[PDB]
């Protein structure tokens, strides 16, 4: 069994996609659930898990079966505990895009996540580990990571810093190897 990963902080998305592509035998994504009606070319259980009934899925959310859910384009979407458990029981590390709130939910589910926070040193530091964002978004993001650390600090399995994203990817890599 392999621990699910949650990367938080700036660069999470890039880190996640990199990991997925770079080591697809080591890493996987879980199948999310949606109440949106399945397009004809879509495959139930691969692209999404397609729920017949919005009332149905609201119940499961109520029933705690999901670690994350929200609404988009008027439909529910979410990550079930079970779809994470399937990846993790596949011997693969499940790459999660989820809020820090999800970690308490993962701990609670016995799924023992690996939660990694990426801590910017300064506003400027954010810009140096992130090429393609504006100065305003860097600001909004530094303040964001601060509020995140204040609240969720006790949830982090580990905290990384760096001058370059490359340095950080390397660090994120080590941490993951170290826990297995």
């Amino acid at each position: 069994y392999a621990r699910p990963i949650i990367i938080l902080g700036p660069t999470k998305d890039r880190a996640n996609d990199d990991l997925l592509s770079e080591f697809p035998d080591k890493f996987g994504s879980c199948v999310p659930h949606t109440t949106r009606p399945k397009r004809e070319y879509e495959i139930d259980g691969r692209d999404y898990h397609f729920v017949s009934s919005r009332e149905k899925m609201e119940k499961d959310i109520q029933a705690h079966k999901f670690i994350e859910a929200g609404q988009y384009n008027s439909h529910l979407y979410g990550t079930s505990v079970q779809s994470v458990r399937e990846v993790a029981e596949q011997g693969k590390h499940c790459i999660l895009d989820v809020s820090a709130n999800a970690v308490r939910r993962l701990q609670a589910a016995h799924l023992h996540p690996i939660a990694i926070f990426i801590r910017p040193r300064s506003l400027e530091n954010v810009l140096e580990i992130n090429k393609r964002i504006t100065e305003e978004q860097a600001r909004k993001a530094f303040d964001r990571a601060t509020k995140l650390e204040q609240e969720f600090t006790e949830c982090f399995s580990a905290i990384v810093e760096g001058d370059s994203f490359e340095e950080i990817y390397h660090k994120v890599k080590r941490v993951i190897e170290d826990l297995s």
């Binding site: 999310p32 949606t34 949106r36 879509e42 691969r46 692209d47 999404y48 929200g70 609404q71 988009y72 384009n73 439909h75 979407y77 895009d97």
Partner: peptide
């Protein structure tokens, strides 16, 4: 071939 699940990433 696998879906890009854009709705999902897009979700708030």
């Amino acid at each position: 071939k696998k879906s890009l699940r854009q709705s999902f990433r897009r979700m708030r």
